[PDB]
Amino acid sequence: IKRIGNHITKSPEDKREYRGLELANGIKVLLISDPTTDKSSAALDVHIGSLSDPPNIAGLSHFLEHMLFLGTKKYPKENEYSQFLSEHAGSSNAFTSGEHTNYYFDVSHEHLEGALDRFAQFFLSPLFDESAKDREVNAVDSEHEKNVMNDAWRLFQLEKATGNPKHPFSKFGTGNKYTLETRPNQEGIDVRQELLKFHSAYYSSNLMAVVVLGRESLDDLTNLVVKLFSEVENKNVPLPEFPEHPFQEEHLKQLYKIVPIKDIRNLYVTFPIPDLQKYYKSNPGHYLGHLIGHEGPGSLLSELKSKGWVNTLVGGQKEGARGFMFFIINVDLTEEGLLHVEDIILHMFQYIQKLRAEGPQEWVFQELKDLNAVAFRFKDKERPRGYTSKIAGILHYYPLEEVLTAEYLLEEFRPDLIEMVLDKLRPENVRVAIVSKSFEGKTDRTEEWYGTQYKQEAIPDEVIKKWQNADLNGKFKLPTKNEFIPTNFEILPLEKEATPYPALIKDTAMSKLWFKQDDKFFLPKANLNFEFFSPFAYVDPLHSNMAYLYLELLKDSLNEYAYAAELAGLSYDLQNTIYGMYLSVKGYNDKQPILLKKIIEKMATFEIDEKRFEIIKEAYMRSLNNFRAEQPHQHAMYYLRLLMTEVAWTKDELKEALDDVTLPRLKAFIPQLLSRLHIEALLHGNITKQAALGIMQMVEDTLIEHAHTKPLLPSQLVRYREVQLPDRGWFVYQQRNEVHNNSGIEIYYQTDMQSTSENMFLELFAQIISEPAFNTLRTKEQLGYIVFSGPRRANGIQGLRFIIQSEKPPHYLESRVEAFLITMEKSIEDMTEEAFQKHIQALAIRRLDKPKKLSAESAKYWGEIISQQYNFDRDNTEVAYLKTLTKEDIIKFYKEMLAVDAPRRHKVSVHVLAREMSQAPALPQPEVIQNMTEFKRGLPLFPLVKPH
Amino acid sequence: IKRIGNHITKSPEDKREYRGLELANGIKVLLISDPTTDKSSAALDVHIGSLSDPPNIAGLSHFLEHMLFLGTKKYPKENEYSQFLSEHAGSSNAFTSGEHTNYYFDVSHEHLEGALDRFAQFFLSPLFDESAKDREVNAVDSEHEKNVMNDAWRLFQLEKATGNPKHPFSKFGTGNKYTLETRPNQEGIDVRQELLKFHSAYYSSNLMAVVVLGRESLDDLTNLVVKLFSEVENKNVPLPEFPEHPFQEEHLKQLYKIVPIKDIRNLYVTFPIPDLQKYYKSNPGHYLGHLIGHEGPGSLLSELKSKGWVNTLVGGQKEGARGFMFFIINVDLTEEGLLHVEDIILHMFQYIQKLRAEGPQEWVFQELKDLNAVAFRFKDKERPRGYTSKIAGILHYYPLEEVLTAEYLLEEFRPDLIEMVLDKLRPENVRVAIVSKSFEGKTDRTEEWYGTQYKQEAIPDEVIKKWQNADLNGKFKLPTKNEFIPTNFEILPLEKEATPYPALIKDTAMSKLWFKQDDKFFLPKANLNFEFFSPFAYVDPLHSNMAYLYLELLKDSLNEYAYAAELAGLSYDLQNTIYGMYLSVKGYNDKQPILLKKIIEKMATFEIDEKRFEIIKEAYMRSLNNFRAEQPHQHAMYYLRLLMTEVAWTKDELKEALDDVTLPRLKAFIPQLLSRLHIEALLHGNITKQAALGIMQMVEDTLIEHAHTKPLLPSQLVRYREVQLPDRGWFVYQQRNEVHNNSGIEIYYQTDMQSTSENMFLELFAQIISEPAFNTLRTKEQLGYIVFSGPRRANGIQGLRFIIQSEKPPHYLESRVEAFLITMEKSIEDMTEEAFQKHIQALAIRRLDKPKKLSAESAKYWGEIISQQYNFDRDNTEVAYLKTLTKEDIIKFYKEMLAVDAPRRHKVSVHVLAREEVIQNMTEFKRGLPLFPLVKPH
Amino acid sequence: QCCTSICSLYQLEN
Amino acid sequence: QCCTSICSLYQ
Amino acid sequence: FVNQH
Amino acid sequence: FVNQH
């Protein structure tokens, strides 16, 4: 009751009334009301990172956030937060940064009290025990043990390592069961006392801020927040910070050499700069990020492209701790790009000095400020989970008025800070880092935490005084006036024939359409997407490889044009599929035609630059062979969708059939692919119907004019179908992951086709085991960190699956899955009516839920139009069938389909094992699959789903 | 009783025994005693044909031969001959020609003695009851009615009935209800007394010679035929001879513009000549037509084909009756061959003039004699049903001591005979006949029986006298020595890999090979078989069109070299399949590799002629839009395959996607098609085990070095599966035929996937109800001429089928089939154990035999390897299983899979209608049904 | 066995 | 949610 | 080719 | 492109 805000800045598109305040104990509280929401939520952000861990025990903050979810004294049950939150269509999640720790959930329609009061005790009073601390560090160990091979983490910790080893930046965030358990009892340090001291010292103070997305009012919930969060008492803890940047001049001007595990080639150029979070009005770092990392005509990337050294390069300024902040120009490299690193960085300082001679530009600021103002004014709707975590996560920095207008509004263009940061970019401040697998035998030093190898090649002053000596220009220039900036923001009125679902309007043997004027959102922007079909796109591996090569070189040769469209708010995406290729163009309403037209005329009338093809061919050949370095459970989810389909090609087919693709073969392939084809599309958003038919008309008329496109026969518009497993069939086959020390498994229970009375059986059974599967297989039995079980739907055929990867041998996992099945059905027959109706209501709220963003319903329409079912109202009738179900119905579903003694039982298993690798029932002897095609030769195939 | 006979001439590679002699009444008999055989037959020929039918009734020999099989005196039940015959694993058949009429049957090992006594009663004394006559007139009408729109019959009767209207050659041989039933009973003539007169007074012991294929000895078969065929009474009927021609020199030098219903273009040239049938010592006509119809460097077909006028040429002797023979040269015409007619015929008389100036040759007669000498020394033995009626048909023309060597050896050279028959070929003796669609409407005459429209124009004297100006010979020259004539013949001895069934000897990712050195027949011959699997050949109708034009154009570009090897017995077939390309080279073992490697290095390194590509493209577009005129029983079989298979392209889509075929399009297709392919092969018969390896190694070597062929990864050796019909499901697909006035149908019961116990359920039920099906549909119900019932083996899935076309509505016609299945439901249960044993015995005789021709061993080993089944010993295991089945098991199979109220019942039907749930479109049908698995290889 | 291409066979056996 | 996937999630 | 009767 | 991070 200390501080109340009067009115803050909101975009005039929103309808959500807001209120900010501050409590007696110094908590920054923000209130959000929404009358028409369906999942309310709240969040919290304690401003304490893993950079306040004690020096002896490493990764205490992460172990504490990981242990706080389990157990309080006002709710002594182990899972009562998770169990009550999952009975009511909610889900909870959390993470730790280097500076703070976010706690957030979401919950159903009005269950604010019963989950917010459970979320408040989180900090009011927590209770731990021996059991939890003893079996939770195993899950944190699995967490680190899956990230010991992740090159996004190995490079991160190696940047943390080679700095100032007396600095708190050189600290480890996770804990690997060794710093958490083995070291503290090696020297007798207790852990529970460390956790109670950490929490009572840091978390209970003023530091945390809260936000809650309520339905009721802006006075109904102010009282609710005050009563719950008044207790936590201010301990007057000042914010931890440190003005000393970790890079002292002894370890500046240095060039390491790192050896990865997955085959990559990269070049990092690191600059240190002082803190610029205080300047959030002029924002000099975004200016220099816009001027350094900018593709287009005559810019830093395009010249390095033209010399064949660089694929791409991301610039910008990288944040750090509170006191300091980085600046990075991160590049990737070609085969002969690693020979010319000094010339690459020479061109980088050529472009720096060419941007240091011209000086600060006001029209670039005005352009960027207009673009951020237009991008703020038509800001789309937000999902209430994830959003409240962000705006609680940035609430510590800004006052009450601009809590929302963060990095959107800019007041002044002050060139003095532009010159300051542009002076701090000097080759006396460089730290180059090269990653290449060509350094196998040359590295002396190795990392202890992760186990990576690197060097110290401190750059002698030859190449420094080659960098800053004489820098006039190459052929660089500043970017020009943008022409894709929008000017038409008029919402077209709803026409006479206004439909709630997309209607077939054109139906020819060449194309078909699906059109809906936007009725709910009223934003001047409309996405539109296409699915072109060709029977020659996936005939053999070679024809499945020219497709990716052609599509990629099309995307390569058009980035130069359309980066200004992606910068103004028009984004496209063009990738291949099994059946044909794909296109999806979204963004502001004014320049979809210009862009789509240029994409089509660049698609049909397409030449090949030979050296670019010869670069991309190798960048794909090195994108096939590093599939062996990736997660085990992803190899399970790859192998299952390879075996359970009609035709699919392995990663071993395509790298053999890349030894045949040549320039003339690909060059003759595009007239073969674009000769006969068929288009399927929906158009959605703010467009009239005559202009919709004109847009797709112009599309197929351009393909007619340039490609000589003919329509396909209707008897060769076909899809693929799923193999039918025998009743009482037990199929398993194992493969061995080469580089990960974990094992993995995915098990598949196949029921039947897509019906309107049979999707709710499997869906309700997958909702009744959603919380207990996690609860007994990851928490109680500690089988690993990757636990997931749900419905899988490919080719119409629906199945219930289990994804789990662990240290244990996989057949142990499959046995304890069967034990979970038996214990689960025993728990099903015991449950009462009220809990069963609670599960039915939880599924009737998760599934009967309107989408907020316009792309969230365009991905609801398109994802079923590409499945050829065309059932738009399956969200109403299906859940109207869900309301009439009896307790017996699910047992009758379970017994003859999913049980061990079942007559209709379909089960296939994929075991991925490692590099060197409470009463389970009796399982029948497996039959193993040693060949995929001889497997799929003796089994029937399902019929395809008839459309609606 | 006669005691005549001497040593019948044979081949020295033969082991069969022969004996010929006459009877006291005049019947000639040839006795063949073969102890190894499994079936047995007897046949005879009556020298009275349909040429001497009474004038009032248009055809009585055919109606007599249809009415002969019914109602013998001694065995008076109607179906008795074919019920004693079909239960002992035999099926008889007979026909009636202009001057002859054969009657042949076949029977099992021992039932010959109880089969001749049903067969001699066709000749001793038949009933000819009228109640079995009013039924057979309709069957002869349905025989005629399917030939009314058949062009090879319309041209036959227009060839006959344009000549002398007084001569008996211009009569009508078949009969409809008009001439048999309707015309006589209006005029008041009884057909019964005409059958009794025509069989009693004109059908005798002379003009009749029999033969028997038995397993009994020399002496025990001679008395058998004497005991059974001495009762045939003699009448000393004179032979129906006439020495004059039907062309009396006023029917010459005319041109017949004939309008067809099928879009065809042909040129018929006809020369009348007298008989050379007495001249079979020199055989001048075969000499002359050999030098006329030759496809080789500097020939007639080479010169006319080189300028785009003709696609094909046939020249030789079209025999008519005793007294006269024709001499014809028949070509096919292109788009511009239709309007350069007199220049074509001018070239034909230019080449005949070159044969006049060169005169006779002796080395060509020596070559043609040595080729028939080696074609007779190594002679493949024919099947018993068909070998008897052949040498009973030609037994009327030769002496008893030379019957087998009748057309297989030649006597001394007679040049003056060839000179006289060459002098008969003059421009004043021509009869040109033109068949073209372009003559429509301009024609003003109609044939009485077939309705064919023809216009008769006498050719002007300017073109006859410019055909007598034909001395500018140019590039026409006589053929050279052939080099495919074999000289090496030895058997290779049996190696230590003595296998009764061929096995793998090579299995790579590139090839796969099966090899059986032949151990039965000991002939210097060999079969080679190939399949070049490729995943591009049936992707799109455009790729099926480009495959078929590639294959046809390759076969056209190679005939120039291949026809010198076809005459010497080296026969090759190249065809396109939904999977890839089928190659098959068969013949003598001497020159197999030269022809095979020439085919390979013409198939890989091949370029295109523009003019030839256009002619082949228009010809195949014609052959695609031409299929609309086909018998209505064959559109149904076309439609069942269209619906059952996974994916199939119709005739309508092929001809529509044929428009976009160009030479640049086809030029890059061939290296795409043969870029990556898997080969599967069979070769057996007189080959060394390593020479099999060589003959596959040089094939894959030549292909990989001339076309850079890479192996095909085994995830793409896929084969199509079959649509699985739902249980208790009935489906109907209707369609309309446009050309024929009849309605077709095909009923299909899907049953289940192939197995040892399923295949014998289905085949034993198909052996139960086949002869009752023929009897009770066609003999009593008089639905139609064509009627068939049996198994349908497609994609490893079994089925039972009914194919019948008729005058009736097909929705009426299906109910007769279902009432037949009820009738044989009732009949199969109220049935004895002995006749069930007979029925399960005759299937164990038909399935368990041994083929004598080596190409039939190849046609079953290859016929099973291409099914991916590999079960080389189905006969023994499966027939062993057959001996255990009981009548209870067949009622299990019926009441479950075939009864009208059966649970597992799979019913699909098509309908082809006359010109005068349901299946709307086949993609929405095959989309919503599941697919069967594929068969597991043995 | 129907030597001539034209056929007057009593029945067609296939 | 987590930012840039370089932070450490609970589930 | 020869007609072969 | 700019490092949004």
Type and span of the H or E element at B611: helix B610-625
Chains linked to D by 3 or more Cβ pairs within 8 Å: A
Interchain pair F1, A319: CB under 8 A: no
Identify all chain E residues contacting B314, using CB atoms and an 8 Å cutoff.
1-3
Q: What is d(CA B934, CA B869) in angstroms, rounded to the nearest whole number? A: 10
Within B710-824, strands assigned E span 729-736, 744-749, 787-791, 800-804
The whole-angstrom separation of Cα B136 and Cα B458 is 43
Q: Does a structural domain hold residue A489?
A: no
Torsion angle, CA of B843/B848/B854/B857, rounded to 10 degrees? Answer: 90
What SS3 class is residue A148?
Answer: coil
- Helix (H) / strand (E) containing A859: helix A855-865
C-beta separation of B882 from B766 below 8 A? no
Residue with tokens 């025994």: B17
Neighbours of A52 (CB within 10 A): 17
* Separation CA A853–CA A858 (nearest Å): 9
Find, among B534, B532, B500, B505, the residue nearest to B517 by Cα.
Answer: B500
Exposure on the CB side of residue B208, measured as CA atoms within 13 A: 23
**Domain check: are B107 and B192 in the same one?**
yes
* Residue A422 host element (H or E): helix A415-423
Would you tell me how many other CB atoms lie within 10 Å of the CB of residue A315? 24
Instruction: Name the domain count of chain A.
Output: 4
Amino acid making up residue A27: I
- Tokens representing B142? 């349905």
Complete edge-to-edge strand list for the sheet that includes strand B93-96: B17-22, B28-33, B208-214, B39-46, B101-108, B93-96
CB A445 within 8 A of CB A309: no
Angle ∠(A762,A768,A770) on CA atoms, nearest 5: 100
Which H or E run contains A355? Answer: helix A341-357
Tell me how far apart the alpha carbons of residues A376 and A370 are, in angstroms, rounded to a whole number: 10
B302 and B188 assigned to the same domain: no
Interface chains of chain F (3 or more CB pairs under 8 Å): A
B476: in domain: no
CB B695 within 8 A of CB B871: no
Amino acid identity, residue B203?
Y
Residue where the block lists tokens 């080395």: B363
A227, β-bridge pairs: none
Residue B69 within a domain = yes
Residues near A491 by Cβ (< 8 Å), separated by ≥ 6? A522, A523, A524, A686
Name the DSSP letter for residue B725.
P
Domain end among B703, B722, B741: B722
DSSP secondary structure string, A230-287?
Answer: SSS----PPPP---S-S--GGG-SEEEEE--SS--EEEEEEEEEE--SS--SS-HHHH
* Beta strand segments in A686-753, E: 710-711, 729-736, 743-752
Q: Are A760 and A752 in contact (CB under 8 A)?
A: no
Residues A562 and A539 sit within 8 Å (Cβ to Cβ): no
Q: Helix (H, G, I), strand (E, B), or coil: what is residue B570?
A: strand
Residues of A designated as active site:
65
The backbone torsions φ and ψ at residue A12, rounded to the nearest 5 degrees and listed phi first, read: -75, 0
- State which amino acid sits at residue B535: P
What per-residue string of b and e applies to B337-358 under the rule 16 or more CB within 10 Å gives b?
bbebbbebbbbbbbbbbbbeee
Interchain proximity D8–A95, CB inside 8 Å: yes
C-alpha torsion A567→A569→A575→A581, nearest 10: -140
Q: Give the domain-ending residue among B185, B206, B239.
A: B239
Identify the burial level of A185 via C-beta atoms within 10 angstroms of its C-beta, where 0-12 means exposed, 13-18 middle and 19 or more buried.
Answer: exposed
User: Residue B422 in contact with residue B355, Cβ under 8 Å?
Assistant: yes
Q: Which burial class, exposed, middle or buried, applies to B220 when counting CB atoms under 10 A from its CB (0-12, 13-18, 19+)? A: exposed
The closest CB to that of A389, out of D1, D5, D8, belongs to D1
Please count the other Cβ atoms lying within 10 Å of the Cβ belonging to residue A515. 22
Q: Are residues A541 and A615 in the same domain?
A: yes
Q: Read off the DSSP letter of residue A202.
A: I
Instruction: Count Cβ atoms below 10 Å from residue A504 Cβ, excluding itself.
Output: 10
Please tell me whether residue A715 adopts helix, strand or coil conformation.
Answer: helix
CA distance B458 to chain A (A): 52
For residue A29, which of A19, A37, A39 has the smallest C-alpha distance? A19
d(CA B359, CA B415): 9
Amino acid at residue number B193: Q
Q: Which residue has the tokens 């199509």?
A: B720
* Structure token pair of residue B827: 């009949």
Q: What is the dihedral of CA A197, A201, A204, A209, to 10 degrees?
A: -120
Tokens 């004043």 belong to which residue? B428
The residue range of the domain holding A102 is: 1-239
Asked whether residue B204 falls in the same domain as residue B232, the answer is yes
Q: What is the dihedral of CA B52, B53, B59, B62, to 10 degrees?
A: -70
B312 in a domain, yes or no? yes
DSSP string covering B613-663, please? HHHHHHHHHHHHHTTTS--HHHHHHHHHHHHHBSS---HHHHHHTTTT--H
State how far the Cα of B762 lies from the Cα of B752, in Å rounded to an integer. Answer: 10
Q: Are A452 and A258 in contact (CB under 8 A)?
A: yes
Chain centroid to CA A886: how far? 38
- Candidates B917, B931, B935, B936: best to mutate against A (most CBs of A within 10 A) is B931
For B850, the token pair is: 């041994």
Encoded amino acid at A119, one letter? F
Q: Give a yes or no: residue B160 inside a domain.
A: yes
H or E, element range at B763: helix B756-768
Closest CA to B247 of B223, B273, B278: B273
Rounded CA gap, B140 and B119, in Å?
A: 22
Q: In what order do the strands lie in the sheet with A797-806?
A: A786-794, A797-806, A743-752, A906-913, A729-736, A927-928
Check B314 against E5: CB less than 8 A apart.
no
Burial class of A922 by CB neighbour count within 10 A (0 to 12, 13 to 18, 19+): exposed
Mutate which: B41, B66, B69, B95, vs C, most C CBs within 10 A? B95
- Nearest residue of B to residue A711, measured between CA atoms: B657
Compute CA distances A795 → A623, A646, A792, B83, whole Å: 27, 10, 10, 55
Q: Do A315 and F5 touch (CB under 8 A)?
A: no
Of B279, B248, B246, give the one whose Cα is nearest residue B420: B279
Q: Which two tokens stand for residue A163?
A: 């700095």
DSSP E strand stretches across A169-235: 209-214
Q: Which of B679, B694, B722 is the last residue of a domain?
A: B722
Question: Are residues A76 and A2 both part of a single domain?
Answer: yes
> B839, B767, B837, B777: which is closest to B805 by C-alpha?
B777
Other Cβ atoms less than 10 A from the Cβ of A437: the count is 15
What's the 3-state SS for B8-31?
A: CCCCCCCCCEEEEEECCCCCEEEE
Backbone angles phi, psi at A91, to 5 degrees: -150, 140
Beta strands in A297-371 (DSSP E): 313-314, 324-332
Q: Is the four-CA dihedral B507, B513, B517, B520 of positive or negative sign?
A: positive
Edge-first strand order for the sheet with D8-9 is A3-4, A18-22, A28-33, A209-214, A41-46, A101-106, A91-96, D8-9
Backbone angles phi, psi at A148, to 5 degrees: -75, -10
Residue A484 lies in a domain: no
Location of structure tokens 């059991």: A131
Strands, E assignment, A527-635: 528-533, 570-573, 582-587
String of b and e for A116-142 (b: at least 16 CB within 10 Å)? Answer: bebbbbbbbebebeeebbeebbbbbbb
Whether residue B18 is found in the same domain as residue B99? yes
Scanning B125-271, the segments in alpha helix (DSSP H) are 136-145, 151-160, 177, 183-187, 191-200, 218-229
- The DSSP call for residue A625 is G
Q: What is the CA radius of gyration of chain E?
A: 4
What is the three-class DSSP state of A42?
strand
Residue A746: both structure tokens together: 């995915």
Cα A288 to Cα A316: distance, rounded to the nearest angstrom? 7
d(CA A69, CA A753): 39
Buried b or exposed e, range B307-318, using 16+ CB within 10 angstroms: ebbbbebbbbbb
**Same-domain check for residues A706 and A749:** no
Rg of chain D over CA atoms, in angstroms? 6
A743, A632: one domain: no
Residue with token string 């930012």? D3
- Which of A534, A536, A539, A540 to mutate: most B Cβ within 10 Å? A540
Do B250 and B232 lie in one domain? The reply is no
DSSP letters, A908-923, are EEEEEE-S--------
Going by DSSP bridges, is the β-strand pair A528-533/A676-685 parallel, antiparallel, or unpaired? antiparallel
Report d(CA B42, CA B44) in Å as an integer.
7
Half-sphere exposure of A94 (CA within 13 A, CB side): 27
C-alpha dihedral sign at A773, A777, A780, A782: negative
CA distance A524 to A569: 12
Whether residues B464 and B544 share a domain: the answer is no
CB A221 within 8 Å of CB A214: yes
* Per-position b or e across A801-833, b if 16+ CB within 10 A of its CB: bbbbbbebebbebbbbbbbbbeebbeebeeeee
Q: Do A189 and A301 sit in the same domain of this protein?
A: no
Supply B131's token pair.
């109640």
Q: Is A76 on the interface with B (CB under 8 A)?
A: no
Residue A611, φ and ψ in degrees, nearest 5: -70, -30
Calculate the alpha carbon distances from B62 to A870, B190, B202, C10 in Å.
65, 17, 15, 9
Nearest to B309 by CA among B265, B262, B264: B265
Q: What is the spatial distance between Cα B854 and Cα B705, in angstroms, rounded to a whole number? A: 34
In a domain, B475, yes or no: no
DSSP state of A199: I
Rounded CA-CA distance A40/A214 in Å is: 6
Collect all residues of chain E within an 8 Å Cβ-Cβ radius of residue B318: 3, 5
| Resolution attained, angstroms | 3.0
Residue A335 · residue A618 · CB < 8 Å:
yes
Of the candidates B244, B266, B268, which has an alpha carbon nearest to the alpha carbon of residue B328?
B268
**Cα separations (Å) of A691 from A516, A528, A686, A695?**
12, 12, 10, 6
Residues whose CB falls within 8 Å of the CB of residue B26, separated by 6 or more in sequence, listed in order: B205, B206, B208, B234
Residues in CB range of B343: below 8 A, 6 or more apart = none
Asked if chain B contacts chain F via 3 or more Cβ pairs within 8 Å, the reply is no
Break positions in chain F: residue before each gap, C to N over 2.5 angstroms: none
In this structure, are A610 and A540 located in the same domain? yes
Kindly determine whether residue B293 and residue E5, on different chains, have CB atoms separated by under 8 Å: no
On whether any CB of chain C is under 8 Å from the CB of B76, the answer is no
Q: Which residues contact B830 (CB under 8 A, 6 or more apart)?
A: none
Q: Please, how many CA atoms are within 13 Å of residue B269, restricted to the half-sphere of its CB?
A: 24
Choose among A208, A197, A212: nearest CA to A234: A208
Q: Which residues contact B96 (CB under 8 A, 6 or more apart)?
A: B49, B50, B61, B62, B65, B173, C8
Whose CA is closest to B94, among B71, B115, B68, B130? B68
Question: For chain F, how many helices (H) and strands (E)?
Answer: 0, 0
CB neighbour class for A342 (10 Å; exposed up to 12, middle 13-18, buried from 19): middle
- Adjacent-strand bridge partners of B797: B753, B794
In a domain, B491, yes or no: no
CB A101 within 8 A of CB A60: no
| Break-preceding residues in chain B (C–N over 2.5 Å) | 916
Cα distances from B311 to residues A682, B562, B615, in angstroms, run 54, 16, 9
Percentages of chain C per state (helix, strand, coil), in multiples of 5: 0, 0, 100
Beta-bridge partners for A913: A736
